[PDB]
Symmetry: C2
Subunit: 316 residues, 2 copies
Amino acid sequence: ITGTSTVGVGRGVLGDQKNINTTYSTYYYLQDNTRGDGIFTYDAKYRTTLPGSLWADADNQFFASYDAPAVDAHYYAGVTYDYYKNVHNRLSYDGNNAAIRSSVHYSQGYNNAFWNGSEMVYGDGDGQTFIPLSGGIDVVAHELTHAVTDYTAGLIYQNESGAINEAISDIFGTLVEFYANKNPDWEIGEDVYTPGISGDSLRSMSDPAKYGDPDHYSKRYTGTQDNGGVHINSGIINKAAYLISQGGTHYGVSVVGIGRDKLGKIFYRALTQYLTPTSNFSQLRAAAVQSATDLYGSTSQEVASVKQAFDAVGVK
Amino acid sequence: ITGTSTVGVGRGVLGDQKNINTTYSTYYYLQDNTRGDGIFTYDAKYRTTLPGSLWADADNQFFASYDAPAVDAHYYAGVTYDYYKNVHNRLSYDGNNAAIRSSVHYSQGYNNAFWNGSEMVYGDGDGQTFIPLSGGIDVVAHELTHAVTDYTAGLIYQNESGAINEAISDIFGTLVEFYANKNPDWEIGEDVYTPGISGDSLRSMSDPAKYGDPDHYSKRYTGTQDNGGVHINSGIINKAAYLISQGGTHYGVSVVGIGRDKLGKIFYRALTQYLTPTSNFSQLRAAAVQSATDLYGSTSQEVASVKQAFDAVGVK
Ligand SMILES: [Ca+2]
Ligand SMILES: [Ca+2]
Ligand SMILES: [Ca+2]
Ligand SMILES: [Ca+2]
Ligand SMILES: [Ca+2]
Ligand SMILES: [Ca+2]
Ligand SMILES: [Ca+2]
Ligand SMILES: [Ca+2]
Ligand SMILES: [Zn+2]
Ligand SMILES: [Zn+2]
């Protein structure tokens, strides 16, 4: 819409109050003109037709419980845009400020959220397994990171390249959650998963095996479900990335941590420069070693920790 | 694009030659202005970013092997539009001539095709399990029928309503395949599935059990895979629809067939008037009985055959 840029206020899924960028033109719309070509949030009104209607509001105050998922989708797409711009100097997901669009209230009781190739889509959850999925900054950033991967490496969504795809999304979802310093941790989806149970999450990067995902290449899943285990085998890479950052000893192999910032620089370089659509885990290791080499030198501690972490999870 | 409407020629996935509606403006584009707000076919160029580029061609002749999937996507979206308009007096999937967009060459070796909420997407197959999926008119019509269902009943994509969703797509995909009289049959996906094996298909409506799908409500799948069995439990409804059309005796229950045309009128009425997002099999039976009643009278043979078919597959 063409209108005047303004600032409205509302409450997110978890009850927290936040200011959001809106546009006025008769109604106030969830349209943020301050970032790139804009961030636009739509109401899918419980249907599966997309994108639905651009979210319009009569008074620029978004405190209704139906508003909550929209506030957070719109706000956390902004934080994710800011992370990539400020940290990695990337303008939006295509590198050229493409507009970011998200639809909330997709379908009824839908327990998922996803990047569909053109925009973000968020279900409201059934209220038992999940609450509206846009309330999780690591979910939002995880899904927006699929758009980055689609425009750069192009990792196909199956077997080892799909598992890399998924792990890259977990890593950057987690780095965005630390960037916003939103009670940060190495788990995925803990703010919106099972409102009735405290302490659990969807996946764990620090200990993937807590939920039954593999933490070593010898335990990888080799069947056909989940497109060859893309959500299951991503645990092997997530555990490597946690070790590079935080350090630790894993199946007897010791890794000195180099921290989150360098972890993000190494993987972002590897994703945008060396990975290709059919990369598998062994070429991810070569790509990460080459990236750390480019950045810190072949005799650095950063290269040595990248090699130790992949050796610890059995990836040669 | 703005240009002049013209007619080009090409070859589809199966090697057959066909005329397709195109638009000229410097290049010839796959843009058909003769139907509704237009039918537009895009090249996703082996990436997952959508929709990709509107298909452009220098000489309006589409005989290259890369062109094949595009020719058939564009041509079979036209035939499906024509079926719904001519038979059911419905203008496009929203009933108001919405433009139909399709992208082909999606990803690499992708064994699937789908309606994503906004457009059609077709993989090229891996060449062993499938060949480019737009070469199957029943696949194209199956997926375009999800768009119709999304705008009308809105059946959610899980457990019994998702299985109805899937069966409705198989039924109308099959009726479009008979409408175009393209070697018609009651199987799904036989033209593009396993190029190396003759005689098989993806599903069967006349005998779902041939591939292991249930053909009676007592054999339904009750777990969690496939969103609660939406592709598996659709066999119960597909077998009912085959019996209403063709007749037969199934688990001892005899059904007089009333033919394909009335089958399509009863289900289209039931879909656009009585089904809702959470309809389950028992309410599909009530909706089909009410539709046949509206159209043919409560003491007709058409009502009696609808009841016998659902009684034959155990749906009360
Ligand atoms: Ca308001
Ligand atoms: Ca957290
Ligand atoms: Ca987290
Ligand atoms: Ca929980
Ligand atoms: Ca040509
Ligand atoms: Ca056939
Ligand atoms: Ca068929
Ligand atoms: Ca075959
Ligand atoms: Zn993902
Ligand atoms: Zn389907």
